[PDB]
Amino acid sequence: TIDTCSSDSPLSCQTDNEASCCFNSPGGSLLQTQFWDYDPSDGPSDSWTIHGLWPDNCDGTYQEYCDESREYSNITSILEAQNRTELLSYMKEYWPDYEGADEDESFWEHEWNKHGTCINTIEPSCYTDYYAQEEVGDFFQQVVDLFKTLDSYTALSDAGITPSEDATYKLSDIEDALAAIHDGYPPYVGCEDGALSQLYYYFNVKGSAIGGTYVASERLEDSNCKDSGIKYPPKYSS
Ligand SMILES: *[C@@H]1O[C@H](CO)[C@@H](O[C@@H]2O[C@H](CO)[C@@H](O)[C@H](O)[C@H]2NC(C)=O)[C@H](O)[C@H]1NC(C)=O
Ligand SMILES: C[C@@H]1O[C@H](n2ccc(=O)[nH]c2=O)[C@@H](O)[C@@H]1O
Ligand SMILES: *[C@@H]1O[C@H](CO)[C@@H](O)[C@H](O)[C@H]1NC(C)=O
């Protein structure tokens, strides 16, 4: 399986070290990104959903589509072949394409191909007893594992911020509520049409992106929302 690195491995971006299987570089800022899909709605009425996991450069720029030889058009089959049946079921629920279940495959392809291929510590050469596309399944598992720790809906709810047809919200309140589950670092908060829409939680990593220690880090982009009047539209509203 993937190589293990010491739990006291040096932190990506925050240290000056050479890229290896145990050091994420140049993609040392890892973004766990989420959606609030209300029109059309997907996922549970009381949960955000997964967008992805993205390696950014430490300056906020990023690479994309970093290895054509490891781009796939069969994610669902790769997961099935690896017996990751609970993961695939979970992805259907919590990593949906808003347009419908039949577009999930294209979306998962997109995320792996664009961004997974750019995580340097995921490459087959970082495995013992590597098997074909092992790192693809591990990536989907890792995104899910990190997402589970970042329950945006509940963090917002606990701070009195819940979806509403009438209520509107202040950016700083949203930011503080979410900063509370991310070591006091707020995510990027993204709005669409004045509605709460996207979240990017930034991390630096000790060790490998698979199984390493994800340390909550400062956002390299703040928000495109207005300071107030923010709508949090209810899912499945009618
Ligand atoms: C998913 O698609 C990939 C890419 O085509 C498949 O991997 C290739 O499999 C072919 C046919 O067995 C081999 O000849 C190639 O060498 C493989 N390419 C690589 C880069 O590994 C893969 O087998 C497919 N997986 C599933 C479960 O269908
Ligand atoms: C990131 C971009 O947003 C679109 N997008 C957004 C949400 C979603 O649930 N599915 C989806 O496909 C994609 O077409 C693309 O991956
Ligand atoms: C999945 O299970 C099949 C059948 O038992 C087996 O051939 C294969 O090695 C398994 N793959 C993984 C990665 O568990």
**DSSP letter string, 75-123:** HHHHHHHTT-HHHHHHHHHHS--TT-GGGHHHHHHHHHHHTGGG-GGGS
Measured CA distances, 123 to 30, 75, 136, 170 (Å): 16, 17, 9, 42
How many angstroms is it from 87 CA to the middle of ligand 3? Answer: 15
What would the two tokens of residue 109 be?
Answer: 């392809």
Identify the burial level of 35 via C-beta atoms within 10 angstroms of its C-beta, where 0-12 means exposed, 13-18 middle and 19 or more buried.
Answer: buried
- How far apart CA 228 and CA 212 sit, in angstroms, is 37
Is the distance from the beta carbon of residue 133 to the nearest atom of ligand 3 less than 6 Å?
no
For the domain that residue 115 is a member of, what is the CATH number? 3.90.730.10
Pocket test for ligand 1, best of 133, 134, 136, 140 (most atoms within 8 A of CB): 133
How many angstroms is it from 5 CA to the middle of ligand 2? Answer: 33
Is the distance from the beta carbon of residue 110 to the nearest atom of ligand 2 less than 6 Å?
yes
Pocket test for ligand 1, best of 68, 74, 112, 135 (most atoms within 8 A of CB): 74
Give backbone dihedrals phi and psi of 106, rounded to 5 degrees, phi first.
-60, -40
Q: Contact, 109 vs 59, CB < 8 A?
A: no
What would the two tokens of residue 3 be?
Answer: 């190589």
DSSP label of 23: B
Please name the amino acid found at residue 13.
Answer: C
- How far apart CA 234 and CA 238 sit, in angstroms, is 9
How many angstroms is it from 104 CA to the middle of ligand 2? Answer: 9
- How far apart CA 194 and CA 209 sit, in angstroms, is 34
Distance of alpha carbon 52 from the chain centroid:
4
| Partners of residue 53 on adjacent β-strands | 32
Please name the amino acid found at residue 56.
Answer: D
Please name the residues in contact with 126: beta carbons below 8 A apart, sequence gap of 6 or more: 2, 3, 21, 135, 208
Please name the residues in contact with 100: beta carbons below 8 A apart, sequence gap of 6 or more: none
| Strands 49-56 and 213-216, sheet pairing | unpaired
Give backbone dihedrals phi and psi of 159, rounded to 5 degrees, phi first.
-95, 15
Nearest to residue 73, comparing CAs of 133, 138, 126?
A: 133
Where do the DSSP E strands lie in 141-224? 188-192, 195-206, 213-216
Domain residue limits at 58: 1-238
This entry's atomic model was obtained through X-ray
Is the distance from the beta carbon of residue 77 to the nearest atom of ligand 1 less than 6 Å?
yes
| Partners of residue 190 on adjacent β-strands | 198
> Any idea what the Cα angle at residue 17 is, between residues 16 and 20, rounded to 5°?
155
- How far apart CA 72 and CA 231 sit, in angstroms, is 37
Ligand 3 atom with the shortest distance to the CA of 137: 13
Is the distance from the beta carbon of residue 72 to the nearest atom of ligand 1 less than 6 Å?
yes
Residue recorded with tokens 């700083």:
172
Cis peptide before 40 (omega within 30 of 0): yes
Active-site residue numbers? Answer: 51, 111, 115
Cis peptide before 26 (omega within 30 of 0): yes
Number of domains composing the chain? 1
Resolution of the solved structure (Å): 1.7
